[PDB]
Design an enzyme around this catalytic site. Structure first.
Site, PDB file in Angstrom:
ATOM      1  N   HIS A 188       0.994   4.600   2.026  1.00 46.65           N
ATOM      2  CA  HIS A 188       0.636   5.204   3.328  1.00 46.65           C
ATOM      3  C   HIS A 188       0.768   6.710   3.217  1.00 46.65           C
ATOM      4  O   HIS A 188       1.461   7.258   2.367  1.00 46.65           O
ATOM      5  CB  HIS A 188       1.544   4.617   4.418  1.00 46.65           C
ATOM      6  CG  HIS A 188       1.208   3.192   4.761  1.00 46.65           C
ATOM      7  ND1 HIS A 188       0.879   2.779   6.023  1.00 46.65           N
ATOM      8  CD2 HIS A 188       1.148   2.103   3.969  1.00 46.65           C
ATOM      9  CE1 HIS A 188       0.632   1.469   5.987  1.00 46.65           C
ATOM     10  NE2 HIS A 188       0.804   1.011   4.744  1.00 46.65           N
ATOM     11  N   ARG A 246       5.264  -3.991   9.001  1.00 45.61           N
ATOM     12  CA  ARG A 246       5.824  -3.335   7.842  1.00 45.61           C
ATOM     13  C   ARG A 246       7.257  -3.807   7.653  1.00 45.61           C
ATOM     14  O   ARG A 246       8.157  -3.504   8.431  1.00 45.61           O
ATOM     15  CB  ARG A 246       5.768  -1.817   8.043  1.00 45.61           C
ATOM     16  CG  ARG A 246       4.338  -1.362   8.316  1.00 45.61           C
ATOM     17  CD  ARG A 246       4.252   0.142   8.645  1.00 45.61           C
ATOM     18  NE  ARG A 246       2.856   0.424   9.039  1.00 45.61           N
ATOM     19  CZ  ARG A 246       2.307   1.640   9.119  1.00 45.61           C
ATOM     20  NH1 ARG A 246       2.999   2.722   8.840  1.00 45.61           N
ATOM     21  NH2 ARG A 246       1.040   1.717   9.458  1.00 45.61           N
ATOM     22  N   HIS A 255       4.252  -5.537   3.413  1.00 47.02           N
ATOM     23  CA  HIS A 255       3.923  -6.092   4.748  1.00 47.02           C
ATOM     24  C   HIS A 255       4.318  -7.520   4.924  1.00 47.02           C
ATOM     25  O   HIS A 255       4.518  -8.283   3.995  1.00 47.02           O
ATOM     26  CB  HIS A 255       2.396  -5.952   4.965  1.00 47.02           C
ATOM     27  CG  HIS A 255       1.947  -4.540   5.184  1.00 47.02           C
ATOM     28  ND1 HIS A 255       1.819  -3.996   6.430  1.00 47.02           N
ATOM     29  CD2 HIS A 255       1.620  -3.550   4.318  1.00 47.02           C
ATOM     30  CE1 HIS A 255       1.391  -2.751   6.305  1.00 47.02           C
ATOM     31  NE2 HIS A 255       1.292  -2.426   5.037  1.00 47.02           N
ATOM     32  N   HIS A 302       0.817  -1.205   0.000  1.00 44.37           N
ATOM     33  CA  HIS A 302       0.000   0.000   0.000  1.00 44.37           C
ATOM     34  C   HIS A 302       0.850   1.254   0.000  1.00 44.37           C
ATOM     35  O   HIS A 302       1.990   1.286   0.468  1.00 44.37           O
ATOM     36  CB  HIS A 302      -0.898   0.141   1.241  1.00 44.37           C
ATOM     37  CG  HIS A 302      -1.387  -1.160   1.768  1.00 44.37           C
ATOM     38  ND1 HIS A 302      -0.847  -1.702   2.906  1.00 44.37           N
ATOM     39  CD2 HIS A 302      -2.324  -2.020   1.306  1.00 44.37           C
ATOM     40  CE1 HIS A 302      -1.472  -2.857   3.127  1.00 44.37           C
ATOM     41  NE2 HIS A 302      -2.363  -3.091   2.164  1.00 44.37           N
ATOM     42  N   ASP A 304      -4.662   1.618  -1.610  1.00 47.14           N
ATOM     43  CA  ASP A 304      -4.828   0.171  -1.515  1.00 47.14           C
ATOM     44  C   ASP A 304      -4.415  -0.519  -2.828  1.00 47.14           C
ATOM     45  O   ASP A 304      -5.223  -0.606  -3.740  1.00 47.14           O
ATOM     46  CB  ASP A 304      -6.270  -0.164  -1.147  1.00 47.14           C
ATOM     47  CG  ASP A 304      -6.612   0.149   0.272  1.00 47.14           C
ATOM     48  OD1 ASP A 304      -5.673   0.376   1.111  1.00 47.14           O
ATOM     49  OD2 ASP A 304      -7.809   0.204   0.621  1.00 47.14           O
ATOM     50  N   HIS A 362      -9.292   2.502   0.020  1.00 52.29           N
ATOM     51  CA  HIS A 362      -8.430   3.655   0.175  1.00 52.29           C
ATOM     52  C   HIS A 362      -7.731   3.942  -1.136  1.00 52.29           C
ATOM     53  O   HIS A 362      -7.379   3.007  -1.884  1.00 52.29           O
ATOM     54  CB  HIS A 362      -7.367   3.355   1.237  1.00 52.29           C
ATOM     55  CG  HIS A 362      -7.959   2.966   2.568  1.00 52.29           C
ATOM     56  ND1 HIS A 362      -7.342   2.065   3.439  1.00 52.29           N
ATOM     57  CD2 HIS A 362      -9.064   3.455   3.197  1.00 52.29           C
ATOM     58  CE1 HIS A 362      -8.050   2.073   4.577  1.00 52.29           C
ATOM     59  NE2 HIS A 362      -9.081   2.896   4.446  1.00 52.29           N
ATOM     60  N   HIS A 382     -11.063   0.343   3.924  1.00 53.21           N
ATOM     61  CA  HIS A 382     -10.043  -0.449   3.246  1.00 53.21           C
ATOM     62  C   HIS A 382     -10.664  -1.515   2.352  1.00 53.21           C
ATOM     63  O   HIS A 382     -11.653  -2.176   2.728  1.00 53.21           O
ATOM     64  CB  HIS A 382      -9.188  -1.159   4.304  1.00 53.21           C
ATOM     65  CG  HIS A 382      -8.072  -1.926   3.701  1.00 53.21           C
ATOM     66  ND1 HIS A 382      -6.896  -1.365   3.194  1.00 53.21           N
ATOM     67  CD2 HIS A 382      -8.025  -3.276   3.517  1.00 53.21           C
ATOM     68  CE1 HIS A 382      -6.196  -2.440   2.723  1.00 53.21           C
ATOM     69  NE2 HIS A 382      -6.860  -3.582   2.891  1.00 53.21           N
ATOM     70  N   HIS A 414      -2.933   4.035   5.966  1.00 46.11           N
ATOM     71  CA  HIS A 414      -3.039   4.026   4.474  1.00 46.11           C
ATOM     72  C   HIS A 414      -3.483   5.403   3.990  1.00 46.11           C
ATOM     73  O   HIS A 414      -4.249   6.096   4.646  1.00 46.11           O
ATOM     74  CB  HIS A 414      -4.092   2.987   4.015  1.00 46.11           C
ATOM     75  CG  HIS A 414      -3.734   1.566   4.396  1.00 46.11           C
ATOM     76  ND1 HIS A 414      -4.503   0.498   4.023  1.00 46.11           N
ATOM     77  CD2 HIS A 414      -2.691   1.064   5.110  1.00 46.11           C
ATOM     78  CE1 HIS A 414      -3.933  -0.614   4.555  1.00 46.11           C
ATOM     79  NE2 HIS A 414      -2.837  -0.291   5.220  1.00 46.11           N
TER      80      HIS A 414
END
Ligand SMILES: [Cu+2]
Ligand SMILES: [Cu+2]
Ligand code: NA
Ligand code: NA
Ligand SMILES: [Zn+2]
Ligand SMILES: [Zn+2]
Lengths: 153, 153
Positions: free
Chosen positions: A48, A143, A120, A46, A83, A80, A71, A63
């Site tokens: 952020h 993360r 992630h 994603h 995403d 988002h 989400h 995000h």
């Protein structure tokens, strides 16, 4: 075309280079590159909100979500802006990333330049996990690597 | 307001965190923070065109210069947008950066978001060195540390 780039780094072995290209105003953004050091399988991916790496990837915040939506996955209307779903690592730990997305942009209010790209620990459940975090983070967990998205030549 | 941040990293370690704040789009940008690991004295300090760290600081390209002007000091009319002069390190190798600049911006066409901040080996001669490189790079020499300028909370 307008172009951007991001160098992904973290505390562990995960590292990569991701490129962005947007040929046309408000057109699709192509996202491509490679990430190594991953466990085999899907990893959430994603943009952020903040391009802040001062304390590593946690400093990037939530995000990127300028429209105040839930989400989702990249194919969903409810998502988002940041995403981008999952990337898939092979048995050697390498993910070949190849995404086209028209919700992100490299200009205007959905611009991702100066924000942080994160890969992630876990797969993103795309908002379909049935706990409250699913429609916030997709339960993607920690993360592993991140970088600030920069203007490219 | 309106904020940005940049984590500078290079060999030494030369490293620092630089903050940016702009109260209004018509106003100056305050630039402040600390850099350690430097040799005592003045070091050139500029925004470079590309937020590309793929091969380290060289990948950031030339100074950010959207008007195609000659290199200068920050006080000069004839300067690159990215020309922030020098920062000064003390005997312990620490520079406390505190700049106000009216030519860079955090929005609009002089926007520096997604570009690279660089601190150099040598002092910047501000275009008054009397060789042709002076009005290009200020003879600031190698790039000791850099980072991409990101949107801050
Ligand atoms: Cu994420
Ligand atoms: Cu420079
Ligand atoms: Na998907
Ligand atoms: Na000066
Ligand atoms: Zn999300
Ligand atoms: Zn310059």
């Amino acid at each position: 075309a307008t172009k951007a780039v991001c160098v992904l780094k973290g505390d562990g072995p995960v590292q990569g280079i991701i490129n962005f290209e947007q040929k046309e105003s408000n057109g699709p953004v192509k996202v491509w590159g490679s990430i190594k050091g991953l466990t085999e399988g899907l990893h959430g991916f994603h943009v952020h909100e903040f391009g802040d790496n001062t304390a590593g990837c946690t400093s990037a915040g939530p995000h990127f979500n300028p429209l105040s939506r839930k989400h989702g996955g990249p194919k969903d209307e409810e998502r988002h802006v940041g995403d981008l779903g999952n990337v898939t690592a092979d048995k050697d730990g390498v993910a070949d990333v190849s995404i086209e997305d028209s919700v992100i942009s490299l200009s205007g209010d959905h611009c991702i330049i100066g924000r942080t790209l994160v890969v992630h620990e876990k797969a993103d459940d795309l908002g379909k996990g049935g706990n409250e975090e699913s429609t916030k983070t997709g339960n993607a967990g920690s993360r592993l690597a991140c970088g600030v998205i920069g203007i490219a030549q």
